[PDB]
From Swiss-Prot, chains A, B:
Coiled coil: none annotated. It is a multi-pass membrane protein. This is CDP-archaeol synthase. Belongs to the CDP-archaeol synthase family. The lineage of its organism: Archaea, Thermoproteota, Thermoprotei, Desulfurococcales, Desulfurococcaceae. Catalyzes the formation of CDP-2,3-bis-(O-geranylgeranyl)-sn-glycerol (CDP-archaeol) from 2,3-bis-(O-geranylgeranyl)-sn-glycerol 1-phosphate (DGGGP) and CTP. This reaction is the third ether-bond-formation step in the biosynthesis of archaeal membrane lipids. PANTHER family: CDP-ARCHAEOL SYNTHASE. The gene is carS.
């Protein structure tokens, strides 16, 4: 069950799974057309870099929308099918905002920014869910962030 | 005033100011003897790197202890003079743990790891305060973290 007060970790995980899926899909869908059209800024660095492709955004968005159907059916909350596309967009925007910040700091495309690399999409998606009218408790907002960390390190321990 | 339930941002700021001061002091005190004795690990990277010096740790510890005297006098809570050295140590340990993680990821000494570079000392200090018996609310734990970010970006906007 998902209501407007996100106050347990399973409910956060249901709400956020479209974002997680939107964030993870571009690594398999590939892509080769950069969102930033290859633009370099006056600091010598790409605006976003090659890691952000238009095929990535579309597959991520498509995947997040499809997952929100599953979130809506699993939870009985049909609003999840309407909200999950917007949340997917926030996840995708936050991942790009993180790449933007890495480039401005001189961090080359692909080099690790620990914490930021794992949480940027979560923070964009979280921001959108709040713009949509959801209230998070701070504890469950922290737990979900740590659950994102645990699964990323869970993805790499396998 | 500082009690055992850290539940407002000013009380968190008083408790944490020794850690902030412990974390900031090594950048001026210099230092040239690495904590890691120059050891390189089998992955080819330094254990900690040159950025962690023994003079840094001592000046940081000294500074954090001195600040806890000010925290104890400002708040009327004499236990702050006893706790602030341990909290300073947690701040120093967390900053080293962050450098450790950067080296294992191939991030060279001094290259930016945004978020991690600003929060590692806060997380060590927070861990020690909880080991000491303090309870944080999640909201004030998040606020203080964002206040650390805001001041670091405040340090750089001046
Ligand atoms: N909008 C996106 C997001 C990611 N990806 C693909 O997924 C990979 C991994 O994503 P990410 O780790 O975020 O990109 P990085 O290669 O690490 O680049 P950056 O340093 O900007 O994070 C990218 O290389 C890219 O192949 C994509 O095509 N389009
Ligand atoms: N225990 C410490 C902590 C820091 N410093 C000094 O303060 C500077 C800045 O601290 P920090 O940013 O944490 O070190 P970095 O140079 O960025 O190295 P790292 O990549 O490991 O973070 C260091 O270069 C070093 O001169 C020190 O001497 N001893
Ligand atoms: K990323
Ligand atoms: K640091
Ligand atoms: Mg609820
Ligand atoms: Mg670049
Ligand atoms: Mg990456
Ligand atoms: Mg209190
Ligand atoms: Mg090294
Ligand atoms: Mg640094």
């Amino acid at each position: 069950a998902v209501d407007w007060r996100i106050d347990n970790i399973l409910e956060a995980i249901i709400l956020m799974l479209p974002a997680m899926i939107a964030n993870a899909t571009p690594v398999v869908a590939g892509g080769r057309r950069p969102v930033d059209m290859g633009v370099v800024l006056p600091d010598g660095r790409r605006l976003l870099g090659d890691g952000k492709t238009i095929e990535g955004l579309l597959a991520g968005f498509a995947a997040g929308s499809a997952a929100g159907v599953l979130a809506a059916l699993a939870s009985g909350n049909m609003l999840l099918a309407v909200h999950s596309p917007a949340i997917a967009l926030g996840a995708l925007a936050g991942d790009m905002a993180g790449s933007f910040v890495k480039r401005r700091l001189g961090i080359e495309r692909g080099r690790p920014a620990p914490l930021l690399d794992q949480l940027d999409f979560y923070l964009g998606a979280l921001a959108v869910s709040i713009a949509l009218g959801y209230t998070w408790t701070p504890r469950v907002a922290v737990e979900a962030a740590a659950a994102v960390l645990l699964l990323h390190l869970a993805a790499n321990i396998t």
